[PDB]
Amino acid sequence: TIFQFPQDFMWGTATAAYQIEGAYQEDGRGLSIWDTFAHTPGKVFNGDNGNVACDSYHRYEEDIRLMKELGIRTYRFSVSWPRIFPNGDGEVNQEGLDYYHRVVDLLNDNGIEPFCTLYHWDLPQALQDAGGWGNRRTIQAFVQFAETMFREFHGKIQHWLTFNEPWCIAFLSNMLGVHAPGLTNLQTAIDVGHHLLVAHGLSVRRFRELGTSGQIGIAPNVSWAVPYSTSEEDKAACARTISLHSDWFLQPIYQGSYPQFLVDWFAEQGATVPIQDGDMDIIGEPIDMIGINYYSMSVNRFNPEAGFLQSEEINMGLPVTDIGWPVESRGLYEVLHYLQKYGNIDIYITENGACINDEVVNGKVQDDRRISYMQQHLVQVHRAIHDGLHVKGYMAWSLLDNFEWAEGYNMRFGMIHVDFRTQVRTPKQSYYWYRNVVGNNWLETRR
Amino acid sequence: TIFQFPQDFMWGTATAAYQIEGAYQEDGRGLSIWDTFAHTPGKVFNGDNGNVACDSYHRYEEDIRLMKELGIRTYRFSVSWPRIFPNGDGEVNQEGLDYYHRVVDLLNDNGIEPFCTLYHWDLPQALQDAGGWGNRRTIQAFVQFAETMFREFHGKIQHWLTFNEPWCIAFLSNMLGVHAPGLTNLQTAIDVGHHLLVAHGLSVRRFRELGTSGQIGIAPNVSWAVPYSTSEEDKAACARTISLHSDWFLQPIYQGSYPQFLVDWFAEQGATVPIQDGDMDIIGEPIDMIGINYYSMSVNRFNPEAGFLQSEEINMGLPVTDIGWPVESRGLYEVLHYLQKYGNIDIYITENGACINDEVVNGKVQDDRRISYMQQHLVQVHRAIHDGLHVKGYMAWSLLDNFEWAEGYNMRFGMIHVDFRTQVRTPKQSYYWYRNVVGNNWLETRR
Amino acid sequence: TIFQFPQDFMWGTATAAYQIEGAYQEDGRGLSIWDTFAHTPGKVFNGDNGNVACDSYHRYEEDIRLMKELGIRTYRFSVSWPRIFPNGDGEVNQEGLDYYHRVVDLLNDNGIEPFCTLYHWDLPQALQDAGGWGNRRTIQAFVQFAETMFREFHGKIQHWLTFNEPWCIAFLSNMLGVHAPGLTNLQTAIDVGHHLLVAHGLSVRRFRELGTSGQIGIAPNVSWAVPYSTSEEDKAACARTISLHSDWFLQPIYQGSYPQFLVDWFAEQGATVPIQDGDMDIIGEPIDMIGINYYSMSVNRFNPEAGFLQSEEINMGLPVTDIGWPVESRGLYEVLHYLQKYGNIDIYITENGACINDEVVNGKVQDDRRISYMQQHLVQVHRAIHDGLHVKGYMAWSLLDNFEWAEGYNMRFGMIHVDFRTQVRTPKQSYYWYRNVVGNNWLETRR
């Protein structure tokens, strides 16, 4: 079947600062909560860390030349907060800003639109020492960081994202303790979540006041769960799983309130959102679009012992990627329609890809399973567009294999293989497949 | 996850006469429309035919010993009509009956409940020469065939199925011309479909009048399609695809009428159901259960040029089995719930399996993909049962690799590999996996 | 180096009833706590169970012919209690006794001395329903079981073992809940341990009173731990680890009391040994020898959170077998000397071997790692003998690959490979290596 995409559909790739840059102590860069987390025994597989990574701090010219020959139109990357404000102290580090100027100018020189993610989990450790995100003072610090970026890169960046995956920053990091700072306290996670939102709203307001060019939004990772049974409890368990990922952040932004159920659910566990007068009005600041990050879908059932959401995921026996996630692309189509509850808003698939660990053999990386995964999901994207939904673009998660957080370098997601012993780049077969798709602007599934 | 099945869940395997028996001219067996079809150049891949097949006419003792060590509780097989009535002439062939007596006695001797399919596509050619199924006289002939079986095997067979997949017998065979007798005429397909139903109702009535022991039903192959778009036309295209497979045969049986839409749809193409007074009352004869045959699910859209149903199947990019069918087990769960429109009737999964062509290597057949397929579908079965649906059993399509109709022996579906050069049987890894599942009565999915 | 063994050193192999026999419902056999445990979802890997196993209930003639060509002088096997007393009810099952008569007569016919283990974990479920081992009534039942065996096989069996690994029966099964009946209660484990001892003493007394021919003892699995540091706490942690395995059962038998430390240790956790007047005198019944079961050694340190013994095992980085146990043969030499605290008693290495999962390739099983493991341990045995210690024999754990309890059939320990799909036996290379060693009565290590 032939799937033809819109004339101005935006094709791209994505990365994150700490996962590819390296040079963690270079040019005055301060430490982030992830440097600390990764340097702690038992937090990251094999003791891997973001020192060096893909050394993209030095090899960005090569990476850009590679994405250029891919035919891509945009590149999503994030800004290392501690490279700009080593202590989130207000004392700017020009060397840090200069790095992004080099990357951005080279991007614009190659006709590639920068898609800037301001916050991709690397909160300066100095700020964490005072409570990081748990402390409202951090809100003011982010706004200064954001404003600095808006003033410095005005006209050079037309697409901005305040936060990448609030659910991970708040709950995965402060409730489940899997990501930095690795805490396990419901109240703290809720505090972090609320403060991210306020910080987001204020940043958007400054963006507007400053007259910065471009559009600005936020990029939540979206979840999707379907009930194992037709029971009301299973249905409720799925509602919680889905809502905590998107609705808990999007309802405040689009409708001015936290999902009541869940608020009640958390109250039962003794937790309450630290809402202060004016907060909700701030969070309700209008945004131009949102980024959606999708990887998988699940079948859940109510289970009193299954985590703080009492929602158990059933292993349905579907094949999984090398990181253990089942592939079921329909979830992307289902959640895109679900999200229409906020209106037919502009949506970019900022994140989508698969962990496939195939290595270089005979000079190539035969990652057929990655091609298969991307094909299936791009079909759902076309399907959504065909339903009249405003899905504006797609960004393959990761141009390069990189530091996959707590998994270390063991889990590869790139379309370009990186041998971390030499830093040599080897485009995978998925890279050439993707180059053809973006170049033609249409896709074909064949037996 | 652990999936525990009901105490009396019935585990089994299935085959069909023409696909495994062989000895096509032995002991007075007459020719069937499939012998004719297969002996015709261009009808079956490579010119393969049912002569010999798995030679189960002679090797049934071995097959039964193999299903016995599998721990199975029932065996679904079909009766070769032309072995009983070489010409559907009324002149019984005792040698034919004796074969099934040997098979059935051996089954009962091994504590394996026979699950008898009366009609599995092998209509005697003599009857086809007069119009086969298109001629109402064939209705009377089937009833005699059926009655003969009820009288001869009373008490030895407690589970009976009149027809296996009416949609294939009628439409696939008489409209699409893919299966014997290979015709391409809408009206003839509709005539065949209607006559099968009348023949089914009369057989059930005789079953009741004779006081034959056991339960009796019919086994349609069920289809499931989901709309590509949210459009009303795509929705209608899916309704036609789904209904023609099940509803067109089940609504008459359970509710006394053909689905009105479709009737109108066919009328537009100039075709009408040849309904005679009393027909619908006959077809409405009460049945004890139904067999459901499921293999795949599809995503469709309306397309004026896509066949007589104008329903186009979209290639979503999902991986497929070796015969080309996508695996998406949710379809089984969806259609089981769909079927509740007829009430919470007793349902047996009479057919489910996958074409996986792995051969014997190092003494074994590592058919992991078949195990994966079966695991996924058994989960949906447990899921349906958990929803309170009366799914009573499951029969893995084919104990043995066999004659896969128009595909010939090229497409293997067995849990037991058969080398057609020697007739040697080699249990596949799926066989040992299945033996463990049925033996334990529960299933476990693991990463 | 050449290691020459004593003229009358006894070479053998070992198995256990539930792990090899199969025919779990045949000839009136009752259910054991292990049938129940294995038939419970989540208790044994893959849902494996002892139904069938190595089908040694039917294939013992072949197994014996194979051990015969091995040149072995004894065969250690266990008696299925529920085959003799289906309900531990007192109602003897002659068919059960007849099975062991066939095995024993064939052994004696082949010049192979039976080495009978009375209790190898298969307590009749009927007895467990009343408290099994936790109920003193079980003590009386075992004595009847034991007495029945002494009377029935007098003169045919000259070597008897009451219990195999009391530590597993009590603590692993009732405190850690890893083995049947899978309980997690300190007090219950201590009760079981004490009752096994009383049952052991009474059985030995009856053995003496009846004048049964042969020698009788008990076979504990011995542990060995060395301190990570020179600290007194690490030293204490190792003392607990070592003593609970052997001393907690041997001190009562040889010296008339439970190790005081440990008694105090358990008292701190609120547990006390249910000692009744006369118990200790009973347990102190004189025995002829003991069987020692050894597999591995460990380096431990004190850790308040490391189990009920607060003894943490350090992963020193040594290579491990396929079941995960490090190989360090010196432990056998160290514990044999440690055990001299009870005098220079007759000791048989009733258990020693390694989990090596090599399969049949090119008609053979190249299990070099098993040969390496056995060579290393036989050297320590020679070493102990050379020190004047009375180590009388050695029995390779398992003639055959079998049901490895909670690991199922996944973990192979045999010197003879068993394909569970066919029950075909294939002697591994270790088998031929062992045949040469036992035949020559000496061993040689070479570079």
Add this chain to the structure above:
Amino acid sequence: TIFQFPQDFMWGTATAAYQIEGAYQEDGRGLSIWDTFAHTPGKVFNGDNGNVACDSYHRYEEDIRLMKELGIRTYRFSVSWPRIFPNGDGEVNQEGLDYYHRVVDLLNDNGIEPFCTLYHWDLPQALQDAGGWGNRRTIQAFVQFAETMFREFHGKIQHWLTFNEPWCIAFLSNMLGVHAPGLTNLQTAIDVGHHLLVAHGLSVRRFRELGTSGQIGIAPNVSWAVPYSTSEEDKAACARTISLHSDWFLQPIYQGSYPQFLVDWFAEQGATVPIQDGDMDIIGEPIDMIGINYYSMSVNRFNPEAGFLQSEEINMGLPVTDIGWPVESRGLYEVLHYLQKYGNIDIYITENGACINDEVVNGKVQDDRRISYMQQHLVQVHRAIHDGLHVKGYMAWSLLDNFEWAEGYNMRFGMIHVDFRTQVRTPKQSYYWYRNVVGNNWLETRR
């Protein structure tokens, strides 16, 4: 398990001049006893010699860049005596000194602390012609060589070692005749041993008098043997084996006398230490630390025919490296504690590694066995430190595969593979494993 090392633990790598340098006749270098020994038929496997070797005389910049990216903090190398004093004649060769200036400056430029071994077996042949080490005149010559180095590299080298493995220089070379000069005379070996000690003491005294910066010590290869039996004779055999390697050199240095037993032992064979007035006082010169070289451990027994020490090593069947040495890391922990008899002195593991001959395949050297070996020994190092012992650093024996003395290039010990046909360097997998360990400063053992 996680093993975290001290904040200032010193990680490094080690090599030796004659084993890596090459350019044996370049820039006025004189011949050493090893050039002579290697150029003699039958002395070194395949007639291999140190001409060329790793050509590190020319390729040191590359080697240093490679150790730099390893994250190492020190580099142990030795000085070719004949490059400095071609004839040990007193006539300095500035070109020789300039080479080490280039190496040392590059090391300091890269933040790598030089760890200088003055004597690593390459005695100038001119000196051997007069008796080499057997002639006291050689003592004066070494002191001049040493002094020259102290004066020339003052402030550039803060870590010095006078002699590397006195046992090899004396006994292996002059009694067993395995290493240059290849003599077999007990008295001569004892003379060499004593003269090395005097030369060592005088060098240390000059070091002190000159005010040279840094610390100075000696690096003996330590042996460890455990008795096969509990007999007093086996115990004595092990004492001799252990003491001749370390105590015979360390007791004189730390306590002012040769181990009395052994002195008596050698007297029985007619040999006496040529001690002159003042010698012992000289040898007793205080040192700052010692280097310990460890590779293996053994189990020995007394045997009148087993060499001049009548100590036979038993082949216990443990797996060995490719050069034939068993791996048993506990020996390192045992000897470190044994050495405390001299007080809790500063100890550096100057040598530790394994001969693993894996070659380059698919662009890499999968030397997993080397990683396994290093992991096991680093654990014992952490273990010793945890016991309060002052183990200050660890140096992996050999950055590069090199000339392994009498074994030639056949036995590879490097973490970096060197193809001697091209001199191409290929970092082995152990290199990347080590880079991660040193970088993190902690180690983790995993199943």
